[PDB]
Every structure is written in C-alpha cells, then in structure tokens.
C-alpha cells in the first residue's frame, strides 16, 4: 500500500546530469541571499539552494543576482552552490487544480496527493488587450439580497470590497462562493463560475477555519484555494496573488467563467514593502515600495470578460481591502480606489447596529451597474433603489412633529431597510430574492411592524413555495418578468399579506 | 548507485509495523441501529371528540 | 474512512522515520568509499557526453 | 400535489376570515400547514437510502 507507493517513489528518483551555472552565496542576511556567480540568469527566475529553499531574483545586479529566500534565513548559510532552476516563476494550472488547497509555489498542501495540472504558466503574463475585450453583459448574482439589488456585480469586472479591519470582510465574500453553488452543481456549462480564493496573509488557524466552512457547506467541488499564510516566507506572500491569476488563467482562457476573491489585497501591500525595502530598492511614499501602483494595478487588470472572438471566458474579481480605522485616504487604499471597478463599502457602525452584511448602502457604487442584475430583478428592484435614498435623507428627521409625507417615507425605509438584512453563511436563490424585494417594493410589508418583518421574509418563503411553487419556478426560469407575471405576484403578496 | 542502496534499504529491511483492525474501531463511530418503528397512535377515536366539539364551541360564523 | 486515511498517513510517516534509521547506517558503511568510485566513472561518462 | 390540498385550504382560510365561528379552527388547519410543509422539505433533503457501494 503506503510501502508500495513508497517503492515507487524512490524508484521514481533518477540520477541526474550535469547543471548549468552556479553560485556561492557571497552574503545571507535578512532573506535576501546575494549570490555572486548565475553568469546567465533570466530576470525574476526561480534559482534554488543548495540546502533546498527556492528563491526568485528580484534583482540582477552589475555584479550579484540578488536572490530573495522562500524560506527561514537559516537555510542558507555563506558560500554554497546556488543551482539555476531555469522557469521564470511559473505554477501548475489545469482543470486538475479544482478542490485542492496549494500553496503558492503550487505544491499539494492540502496533503491530498500530487496536483494533477495540464499546463504550467508563467506567473507575471501580461493582461487580456484592448481588442480581446468585449463589455460585461452577464450577471454574477452574489446570493447576498443586498449586494445582488443595490450594487450589482457582473462577470469580468474587478469590485472592491474595501472595508473596516475585521468587521467580517471575509464573510461577504464568503458568502459569494457559497451561492455559486446553485449554478454550480448543474449541467449548464456556460453558468458554472469556478471560483478560486487567495487567501494571503490570513493565519494557517484561519485559513482552516475556510477549508472547514467550505467543505461544510459542501463548496470544494468548485474551490482551489491559493493560500500562502502569514507564517510563510516575504517572498511567498509577494508571490502569492500573482500565482493566483495564473491558476484564474486556465479557466479565462478554456473558456469556463470564473470568479477570483483575492482577500485581501491590504495584505499583498505589505509584503510587497517588505521585499523592496530589505532589497534597499528606492523607498516611496508612505514608505510603501516606490512602484506599488504598477504592482496593484497589473494584478487586478488580469480579470477581464473576454469577447465572443476569443471564447467569451470570463475572470470576474474581487479584490477585498482593509482600511485602518476607515481612513480611505490612506494611500494603499486609494491607489487600490482608483485601480477598481466599483466598491462595496462595508461600514462598522452598520456592522454594530445589526446590519449584516453591512454594506453602507449610500457609499457602494457599481460602476458596471445595470449590465448585470438578473433582467427580473432588474425590473423589481429599480424603485428599491430610489426608495432607500430617500430614507437615507429623511433619516435625520427621525430626531418629532413630522410630516405625512415624512412619516410614510419613514416607515417605508425602516421596513425596507430591515427587510434587507441576511442571516450570515447562508446564501439565498435569486428566485427568491425577486418575490422578497417585490413586497418590499410594492408597499405591502408596510404595514408589518418591524419585529415582525424577520418573521414574515421566512413564511413569505415557505408560503410561496406552498401555494404558487409554479410562480417561483416561472420566475426562475423565464428570468424576465412579464406583466403577467407580475400580476400573479401581485395577487400572491396580496394573499400573504392577508394571512 | 545510492539510488539502488536507499531502495534496497528501505524496502528489505524494514516494512510496516504492526496496527490492528479493532484498535480502529476505538477512532472511528461505529454502526447502532436505528431503534423504534415509531409508530403513531390514533387520536380522537370516537363521536366523544365530536360531542364535545359540537357543544363546546357554539360561535357562530358570522 | 476517515480513521483509515489517517492510518495510512500515520504508516507513511512511521516508514519515514525507519527510512531515516536506514540512512544512518548506510552512511557508515565502507560504500561510502566504493561507491565514490561509481560516481568518479559516472561523471567520466557524463562529461564525455557532452 | 400537496399544493392542491392547500390551496383550497388558503382559499378556505381567506373565506373562514367570513366566519366568526372559528376559535381554534384556524389553528388546526395552521398546524397541518406546519407538518405538511415538514413533510415536504423532509422529502426534498433525503439522503439516498444506502451507501454507495459503487464509490463509497
């Protein structure tokens, strides 16, 4: 068995020939290894020690490659053959990788075997261009009610999720993965996003605390997750979303769609100062390294929809970014800002006040907006939009003798508003998010006093499962909503109110 | 060459070690059965319910 | 079938630990002189080859 | 289906609303709602009844 598989490992280890190039490290400190010899060495090429840690050259200096340690400092030790790997930093990427955890050089850390890929692709390949592009036209409906109505995301194009340090950022994207499940699981090849998560600088506890949630939930089937954790080597955690666009690359280019989470970028900002700085490469503002808006920005350009000429594929992205204390003027979260394509602005004192998710709903823009949206809840969903700006601005009159006017925006909003909550790791059907908004939108929730409204989302539910499951299931499926079809709904919310 | 001496090595000299069927049995949950039918007993037999009821409650529909 | 994928990865690490036992002992042994020669001949015919 | 039954059940709830007879009425055609609507998501989450011994 074990012994078997043993026997043939060491059968499977053959005598080698003869390895061009080689160095002597002329000093190791501070895991930049500075290696005099590598007469021929590609820039950024991976080289390998003599003790057995991999390292990349960063730099290629007029008379030392500067080679920059994977792994702990005490692995190389002064003078001692630096090996020339010879492929510039490259990954397995195949339909192969799907549900398996690896870490960013590739290598099966999930301890499931070896990673069974179909290609190895380079890890710094350059963005889809101006021509390859066609303009997103395909909703990705997140299954959260708020994020799918008030902030639409569409496939191929990057959305932020910037947001304040641990006020459950990860969860909102959890979430999203979660609901990829219902396209997923099906036989319609052009609905099944493949969803990748990179998950950089998070602690190997939190990183299983994911792999446990997903596999909970019953998600890896359509789950690679990259994870190069805050143990792990500078150099890793540089590596580390890079090597996550070129696994995202296979799926783009075979023409599948695919959803790439990198979470969170805060965290690659921070690594990237790291590598430069001990690499005495100029410092820049804010002491974040000098290029840091080149890095950002060739990361997040690689997601991309790609035309009907080059396979329509898609890499829809969501970059999640932390914001100390909310200062979004801080520079790693405006450079990111600018970068995107849209934000979520996930808000703490929402996050307190009960609102979970917590998306503060007046600073969320979708910048690729009504392309996406099920065309349905499009129609459904318009007026939810312009009715929770007015409560937003009628909200400080809260404070006495009011209007009629302002009294039934009030209670409108508050119904609304509390209507829109979702109870956390658990995804909902898109065709039951156009009959929740619906009552919403129609004023029929209204009356139904703000306790109750809780009560009432679940039994409206149930209720329109019972009685018309041929009405969900037209909504479903006809995915547009016909006048007819907005009649019977009328009548059924009319029905459910009632009871 | 040292190839041939770790095979060689490691596959005559030793192998597995001992591990026995039963002391698995402790790590992992083992099959019980699922006990009861559970059967339901009828409830309300009788015109006694229907007695009652009639009586009981007298409001009218209205 | 989760105990039984825990006992194979406990047999693969307990054959590892034996296999490093192996390698201690190979190290010692006067193969560590003769099978310097076979790498002396190796390199002649790899070189060569070139 | 189910959904027949109930139907004229909700039917006959919005016309029982025309009855002020009801007292507890309403209560138990609520509570076959409730079990029936246990019944169905039952239904919906079984599991296949054996192990594969195909895969598993």
Redesign the interface.
């Known amino acids: 068995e074990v012994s078997s598989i043993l026997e043939e490992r060491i059968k499977g280890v053959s005598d080698e020939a003869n390895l061009n190039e080689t160095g002597r490290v002329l000093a190791v400190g501070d895991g930049i290894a500075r290696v005099f010899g590598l007469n021929n060495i590609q820039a950024e090429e991976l080289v390998e020690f003599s003790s057995g840690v991999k390292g990349m050259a960063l730099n290629l200096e007029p008379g030392q490659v500067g080679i920059v340690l994977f792994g702990s400092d005490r692995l190389v030790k002064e003078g001692e053959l630096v090996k020339r790997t010879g492929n510039i930093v490259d990954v397995p990427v195949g339909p192969g990788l799907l549900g398996r955890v690896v870490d960013a050089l590739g290598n099966p850390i999930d301890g499931k075997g070896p990673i069974d890929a179909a290609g190895r692709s380079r890890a710094q390949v350059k963005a889809p261009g101006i021509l390859p592009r066609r303009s997103v036209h395909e909703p990705v409906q997140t299954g959260l009610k708020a994020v799918d109505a008030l902030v639409p995301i569409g496939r191929g194009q990057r959305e932020l999720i910037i947001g304040d340090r641990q006020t459950g950022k990860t969860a909102v994207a959890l979430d999203t993965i979660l609901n990829q499940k219902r396209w997923n699981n099906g036989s319609d090849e052009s609905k099944k996003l493949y969803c990748v998560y990179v998950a950089v600088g998070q602690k190997r506890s939190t990183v299983a605390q994911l792999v446990q949630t997903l596999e909970q939930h019953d998600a890896m089937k359509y789950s690679i997750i990259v994870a190069a954790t805050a143990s792990e080597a500078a150099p890793l955690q540089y590596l580390a979303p890079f090597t996550a666009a070129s696994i995202g690359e296979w799926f783009r280019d075979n023409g599948k769609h695919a959803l790439i989470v990198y979470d969170d970028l805060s965290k690659q900002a921070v690594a990237y100062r790291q590598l430069s700085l001990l690499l005495r490469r100029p410092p820049g503002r804010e002491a974040y390294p000098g290029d840091v808006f080149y890095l950002h920005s060739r990361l997040l350009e690689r997601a991309a929809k790609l035309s009907e000429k080059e396979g329509s594929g898609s890499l829809t992205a969501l970059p999640v970014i932390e914001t100390q204390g909310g200062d979004v003027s801080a520079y790693i979260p405006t450079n990111v800002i600018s970068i995107t394509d849209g934000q979520i602005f996930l808000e703490a004192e929402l996050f307190y006040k009960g609102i979970r998710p917590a998306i503060n709903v007046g600073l969320s823009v979708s910048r690729v907006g009504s392309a996406a949206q099920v065309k349905a809840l499009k129609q459904v969903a318009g007026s939810l939009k312009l009715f929770l700006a007015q409560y937003r601005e009628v909200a400080a009159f809260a404070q006495s003798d009011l209007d009629a006017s302002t009294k039934q925006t009030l209670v409108r909003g508050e119904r609304l508003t509390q209507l829109l909550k979702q109870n956390q790791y658990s995804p909902l059907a898109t065709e039951e998010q156009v009959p929740l908004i619906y009552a919403g939108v129609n004023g029929h929730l209204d009356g139904i006093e703000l306790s109750r409204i809780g009560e009432f989302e679940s039994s409206f539910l149930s209720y329109l499962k019972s009685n018309h499951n041929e009405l969900l299931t037209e909504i479903r499926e006809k995915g547009e909503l016909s006048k007819e079809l907005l009649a019977s709904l009328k009548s059924a919310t009319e029905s459910f109110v009632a009871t | 060459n040292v190839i041939q001496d770790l095979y060689l090595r490691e596959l005559k000299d030793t192998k597995l070690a001992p591990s026995t069927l039963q002391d698995a049995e402790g790590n992992v949950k083992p099959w019980n059965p699922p006990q009861k039918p559970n059967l339901p007993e009828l409830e309300l037999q009788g015109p006694e319910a229907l007695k009652a009821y009639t009586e009981q409650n007298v409001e009218t529909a209205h | ?4 994928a ?7 690490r ?2 590892a630990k ?2 490093i ?3 201690q ?2 190290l010692g042994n006067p ?1 560590f002189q003769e ?1 310097v020669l ?2 002396s001949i ?1 390199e002649i015919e ?2 060569l080859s ?1 | 289906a189910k959904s027949a039954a109930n139907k004229l059940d909700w039917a006959k709830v919005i016309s029982s609303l025309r009855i002020t007879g009801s007292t507890a009425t309403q209560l138990s055609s609520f509570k076959k709602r409730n079990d029936e609507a246990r019944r169905q998501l039952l239904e919906l989450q079984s599991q296949p009844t054996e192990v594969d011994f195909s895969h598993y």
């Open positions: 079938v989760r105990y039984e825990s006992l194979r990865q406990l047999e693969q307990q054959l034996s296999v036992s192996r390698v002992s190979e193969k099978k076979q790498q190796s790899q070189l070139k």
